[PDB]
Amino acid sequence: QDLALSCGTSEASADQDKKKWEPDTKFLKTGNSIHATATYQDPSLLSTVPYMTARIFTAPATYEIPIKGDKRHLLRLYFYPSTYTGLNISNSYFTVEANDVTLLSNFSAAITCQALTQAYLVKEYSLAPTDKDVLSIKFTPSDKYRDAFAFINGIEVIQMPELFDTAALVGFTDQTMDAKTANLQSMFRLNVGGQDIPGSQDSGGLTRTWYNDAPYIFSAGLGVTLQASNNFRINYQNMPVSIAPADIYKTARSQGPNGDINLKSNLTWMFQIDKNFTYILRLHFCEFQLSKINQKVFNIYINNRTAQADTTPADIIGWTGEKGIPMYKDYAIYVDAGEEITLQMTPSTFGQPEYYDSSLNGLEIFKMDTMKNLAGPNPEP
Amino acid sequence: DLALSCGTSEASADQDKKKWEPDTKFLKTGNSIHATATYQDPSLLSTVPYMTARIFTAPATYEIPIKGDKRHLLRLYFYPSTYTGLNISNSYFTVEANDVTLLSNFSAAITCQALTQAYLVKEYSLAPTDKDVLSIKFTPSDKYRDAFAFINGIEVIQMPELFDTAALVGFTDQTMDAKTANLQSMFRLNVGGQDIPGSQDSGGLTRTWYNDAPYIFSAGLGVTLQASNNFRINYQNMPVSIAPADIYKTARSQGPNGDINLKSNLTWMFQIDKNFTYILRLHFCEFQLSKINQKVFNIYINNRTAQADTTPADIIGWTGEKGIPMYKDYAIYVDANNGGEEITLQMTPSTFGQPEYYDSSLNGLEIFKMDTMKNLAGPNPEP
Ligand SMILES: *[C@@H]1O[C@H](CO)[C@@H](O[C@@H]2O[C@H](CO)[C@@H](O)[C@H](O)[C@H]2NC(C)=O)[C@H](O)[C@H]1NC(C)=O
Ligand SMILES: *[C@@H]1O[C@H](CO)[C@@H](O[C@@H]2O[C@H](CO)[C@@H](O)[C@H](O)[C@H]2NC(C)=O)[C@H](O)[C@H]1NC(C)=O
Ligand SMILES: *[C@@H]1O[C@H](CO)[C@@H](O)[C@H](O)[C@H]1NC(C)=O
Numbered sequence: 001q002d003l004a005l006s007c008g009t010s011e012a013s014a015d016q017d018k019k020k021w022e023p024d025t026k027f028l029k030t031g032n033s034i035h036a037t038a039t040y041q042d043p044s045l046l047s048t049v050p051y052m053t054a055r056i057f058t059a060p061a062t063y064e065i066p067i068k069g070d071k072r073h074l075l076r077l078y079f080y081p082s083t084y085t086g087l088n089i090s091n092s093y094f095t096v097e098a099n100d101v102t103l104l105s106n107f108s109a110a111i112t113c114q115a116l117t118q119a120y121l122v123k124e125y126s127l128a129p130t131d132k133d134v135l136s137i138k139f140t141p142s143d144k145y146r147d148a149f150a151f152i153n154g155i156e157v158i159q160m161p162e163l164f165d166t167a168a169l170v171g172f173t174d175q176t177m178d179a180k181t182a183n184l185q186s187m188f189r190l191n192v193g194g195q196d197i198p199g200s201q202d203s204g205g206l207t208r209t210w211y212n213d214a215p216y217i218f219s220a221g222l223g224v225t226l227q228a229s230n231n232f233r234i235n236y237q238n239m240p241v242s243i244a245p246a247d248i249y250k251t252a253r254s255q256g257p258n259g260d261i262n263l264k265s266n267l268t269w270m271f272q273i274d275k276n277f278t279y280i281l282r283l284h285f286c287e288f289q290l291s292k293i294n295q296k297v298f299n300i301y302i303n304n305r306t307a308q309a310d311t312t313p314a315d316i317i318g319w320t321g322e323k324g325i326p327m328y329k330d331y332a333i334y335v336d337a338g339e340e341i342t343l344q345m346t347p348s349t350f351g352q353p354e355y356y357d358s359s360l361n362g363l364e365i366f367k368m369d370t371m372k373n374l375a376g377p378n379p380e381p
Numbered sequence: 382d383l384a385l386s387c388g389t390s391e392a393s394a395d396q397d398k399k400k401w402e403p404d405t406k407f408l409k410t411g412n413s414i415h416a417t418a419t420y421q422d423p424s425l426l427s428t429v430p431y432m433t434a435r436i437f438t439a440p441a442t443y444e445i446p447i448k449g450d451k452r453h454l455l456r457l458y459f460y461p462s463t464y465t466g467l468n469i470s471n472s473y474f475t476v477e478a479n480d481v482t483l484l485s486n487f488s489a490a491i492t493c494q495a496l497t498q499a500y501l502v503k504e505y506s507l508a509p510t511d512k513d514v515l516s517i518k519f520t521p522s523d524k525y526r527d528a529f530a531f532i533n534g535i536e537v538i539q540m541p542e543l544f545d546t547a548a549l550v551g552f553t554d555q556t557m558d559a560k561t562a563n564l565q566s567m568f569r570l571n572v573g574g575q576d577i578p579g580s581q582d583s584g585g586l587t588r589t590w591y592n593d594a595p596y597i598f599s600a601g602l603g604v605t606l607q608a609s610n611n612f613r614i615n616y617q618n619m620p621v622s623i624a625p626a627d628i629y630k631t632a633r634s635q636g637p638n639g640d641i642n643l644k645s646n647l648t649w650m651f652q653i654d655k656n657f658t659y660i661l662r663l664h665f666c667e668f669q670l671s672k673i674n675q676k677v678f679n680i681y682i683n684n685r686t687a688q689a690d691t692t693p694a695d696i697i698g699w700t701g702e703k704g705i706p707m708y709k710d711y712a713i714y715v716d717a718n719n720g721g722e723e724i725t726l727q728m729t730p731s732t733f734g735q736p737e738y739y740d741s742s743l744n745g746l747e748i749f750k751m752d753t754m755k756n757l758a759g760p761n762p763e764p
């Protein structure tokens with residue numbers, strides 16, 4: 001049932017990553033709308049597909065997408081804020097609903113793009129099984145602003161495995177958060193210590209993009225990036241390959257070879273998020289240089305609270321049992337009053353490890369829905 | 382989509398601008414052997430992927446990340462030549478792909494010798510298995526101690542669900558479902574037209590469509606037809622992945638003499654594997670006539686009825702307009718009392734409804750083997 005719809009097109013198209021797109025026409029169910037073309041092509045666009053073409057809604061409109069009601073789905077909304085049909089994009093405020101889940105509300109693509117110094121947006125969601133064979137995507141211009149309108153450049157609907165289970169609540173002992181039936185928004189997805197991974201190289205056929213993590217490091221010093229040897233094989237064992245592609249686990253960011261400096265600092269990532277949501281941090285690990293337990297043992301903190309410390313710090317081989325075996329660990333945190341998530345790691349002195357270091361291979365951050373809502377406020381410029 | 386040239390360590394490209402990459406990072410099992418052939422047959426269209434092979438002396442498995450809900454095209458390339466320190470005629474092995482048996486006791490040397498070709502490409506369409514890994518397992522025969530397995534190239538390509546139902550030959554108004562079937566591509570023909578390389582195939586599937594003349598059994602090659610310059614094939618709602626436009630721009634017909642056409646069947650014959658159900662996909666497009674009841678013809682498969690009597694074939698009658706392409710699927714179980722090892726396709730004009738012409742035509746032809754008990758493996762041919 002997978003779809004890649006470029007809205008506002010009339011023939012097939014393909015982007016710079018060879019992904020094939022088709023017109024959205026046969027899936028638009030209610031309302032009126034016209035095709036529109038952007039008046040300015042930003043040089044930061046990796047492709048004109050699907051960004052340069054849009055469908056404009058000056059009144060509510062609904063898509064109906066056939067899906068398997070028993071399955072989880074990825075939903076991607078592509079937005080390219082430009083001048084369409086002579087309208088000022090600053091008047092665009094609208095709501096997007098996927099069945100009973102609110103994804104966006106008073107959403108301003110123009111404001112959101114300006115705050116991120118970015119010409120385009122991709123909003124990605126993982127929707128729990130609906131038990132309905134139709135996914136209704138409804139666009140509603142705001143009733144609070146006069147001249148408000150909605151727009152969309154591309155829509156992707158991708159069936160995906162149930163890759164979410166439970167997550168350990170940070171700072172609490174033996175408290176878990178269940179995400180098995182949660183609706184999630186992908187906030188960030190990083191190949192830590194490695195290059196961007198395009199969707200064409202993603203596993204599971206999910207065409208996820210994994211970005212390099214360097215822009216999110218806020219500690220002084222970016223550590224030391226590592227790469228597995230030539231033809232090193234990642235031994236997934238019973239972990240589904242859909243969790244993350246092999247190239248995620250073939251690279252990592254570490255603190256470095258000097259244990260004394262490592263003991264005096266935290267490797268620190270920071271991320272801007274929306275307040276009043278619980279977030280899941282999925283940390284991907286794979287040891288490809290060391291071989292034994294108690295060689296590399298490190299503490300991990302999330303928002304200044306403990307996620308592996310004290311007498312149970314992180315040790316990849318301790319968790320996996322053998323070098324080359326990949327793994328992930330899910331942690332949960334409720335964020336209220338700030339609006340950023342900080343991830344920190346530093347060596348542990350517990351148990352006298354051979355080295356004083358820390359490492360991480362990949363990172364994903366998901367927002368969990370609260371009463372069927374994932375929509376946050378627009379950022380400040 | 383993946384094109385693995387087995388036994389290589391660097392990326393390569395063939396004669397049709399297809400890029401290939403080494404297979405090593407997808408191989409799960411160790412202690413394989415890689416070898417380069419010591420003789421390059423001049424009939425090879427390219428040294429890629431044929432001239433390099435991987436050899437297995439024990440069961441070996443490739444693990445290829447896939448999307449579980451997708452149907453996939455799977456191609457296996459074999460070049461039974463001389464490799465240093467190996468006897469290729471000793472090779473008998475099994476190939477399975479996610480619980481589907483593709484080959485068993487397979488001898489690439491014997492198969493190549495019977496076909497009088499130096500290389501082999503086996504192509505399969507694998508139904509969704511709802512797993513994110515395609516496990517391709519090569520098992521040397523446990524009947525022969527010195528038997529080993531080998532492979533030169535592997536292709537895995539996502540493909541749409543291009544198969545639905547098929548009309549059962551010889552029975553009226555009875556259908557066969559192939560939506561979830563595993564298929565082997567047996568023949569793929571551009572009827573009346575030139576070879577179409579994979580680079581010119583539709584839907585990114587890089588299928589090759591071959592001219593059909595070698596398979597004509599009837600006395601007389603009929604008359605080939607070609608559409609006018611820039612003739613527009615109007616697919617409408619038929620997916621373009623079904624077949625490229627040039628398939629529908631050529632056809633083979635019986636000819637302009639309706640009196641002679643009524644006295645004979647235009648006949649193709651194909652060698653296949655006994656004890657299997659086969660689907661014949663007949664591709665049609667009328668690019669000369671414009672009205673219903675102008676060309677009306679009977680079609681027979683294995684001397685049995687597939688559109689005859691009061692429901693014969695009429696392209697415009699099916700399509701409604703010239704220039705629109707289409708296909709019809711017919712299914713037949715071939716055993717000892719149904720042709721043995723052969724499929725025969727026959728067409729002749731119909732006398733029902735008094736058509737304006739007495740002719741028949743066909744634009745393309747694909748033959749697929751359906752799996753039985755998750756098995757597609759047949760015996761080796763006879764020298
Ligand atoms: C719709 O979104 C706009 C933009 O975020 C909101 O307007 C801003 O409100 C914040 C906080 O009240 C101010 O700091 C900004 O200066 C405002 N910007 C603009 C351009 O107005 C607005 O409140 C939202 N409307 C609703 C109904 O939620
Ligand atoms: C494996 O395949 C070989 C090759 O087809 C089989 O050997 C042939 O068997 C046929 C039928 O009896 C004979 O006519 C040929 O002379 C044989 N050729 C050779 C080279 O032996 C063999 O029987 C198959 N083995 C199994 C276990 O199925
Ligand atoms: C765009 O809309 C905003 C709405 O606040 C307005 O201030 C601005 O003048 C508009 N720009 C143009 C070019 O009309």
Ligand SMILES: *[C@@H]1O[C@H](CO)[C@@H](O)[C@H](O)[C@H]1NC(C)=O
Nearest residue numbers: 275276277336337375376377
């Ligand atoms: C965030 O939570 C505070 C505390 O209850 C509440 O006052 C505020 O309205 C919330 N903001 C949003 C956007 O939900």
Ligand SMILES: *[C@@H]1O[C@H](CO)[C@@H](O)[C@H](O)[C@H]1NC(C)=O
Nearest residue numbers: 263264265266301304344346
């Ligand atoms: C690491 O971060 C935690 C939480 O922010 C802090 O308590 C600790 O002192 C830091 N450790 C080092 C070595 O900076």
Ligand SMILES: *[C@@H]1O[C@H](CO)[C@@H](O)[C@H](O)[C@H]1NC(C)=O
Nearest residue numbers: 654655656657716717759760
């Ligand atoms: C074909 O089917 C018949 C009938 O069951 C069986 O006896 C025979 O062994 C089969 N032959 C082959 C080559 O599969």
Ligand SMILES: *[C@@H]1O[C@H](CO)[C@@H](O)[C@H](O)[C@H]1NC(C)=O
Nearest residue numbers: 643644645646681684727729
């Ligand atoms: C055409 O083929 C059918 C099926 O084999 C046969 O019954 C018929 O006699 C043939 N017609 C001619 C004219 O040979």
